[PDB]
Amino acid sequence: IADSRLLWDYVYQLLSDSRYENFIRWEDKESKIFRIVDPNGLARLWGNHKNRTNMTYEKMSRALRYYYKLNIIRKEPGQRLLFRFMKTPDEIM
DNA sequence: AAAGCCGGATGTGAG
DNA sequence: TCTCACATCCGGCTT
Numbered sequence: 737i738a739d740s741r742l743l744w745d746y747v748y749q750l751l752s753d754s755r756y757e758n759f760i761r762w763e764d765k766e767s768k769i770f771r772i773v774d775p776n777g778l779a780r781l782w783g784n785h786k787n788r789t790n791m792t793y794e795k796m797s798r799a800l801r802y803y804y805k806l807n808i809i810r811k812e813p814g815q816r817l818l819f820r821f822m823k824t825p826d827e828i829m
Numbered sequence: 830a831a832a833g834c835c836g837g838a839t840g841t842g843a844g
Numbered sequence: 845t846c847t848c849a850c851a852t853c854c855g856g857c858t859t
Contacts, residue, residue: 742849788851794833799850801835816833816859 743799744808746785748825750778768821775817 740746750756751770759778763769772778775793783791803809812818
């Protein structure tokens with residue numbers, strides 16, 4: 737968690753700690769489908785994790801959208817705040 | 830309406 | 845350096 741520096745890694749570690757389920761949680765752990773339960777809250781954690789000021793979900797969602805073309809994380813269509821990891825942490829590296 | 834999601838255009842700071 | 849990995853902003857589309 738603390739050693740993490742990329743957004744996909746930080747999101748993955750929060751999804752591994754049950755103390756953060758009210759921010760972000762698995763909906764299908766095997767398929768690596770997760771839901772962002774608190775968009776504004778998760779953005780606050782991401783900004784604090786990067787020692788940054790004024791991090792918002794609008795800006796953080798843009799970073800997730802860059803993962804679309806890179807085949808790292810894809811958004812489940814038609815659903816709200818439902819995303820899917822396309823690669824394991826090893827496949828991304 | 831108004832908020833959620835999209836990708837373009839550019840900035841930025843670390844490596 | 846350029847590249848990388850977002851960060852910042854925004855108009856257009858969608859819900």
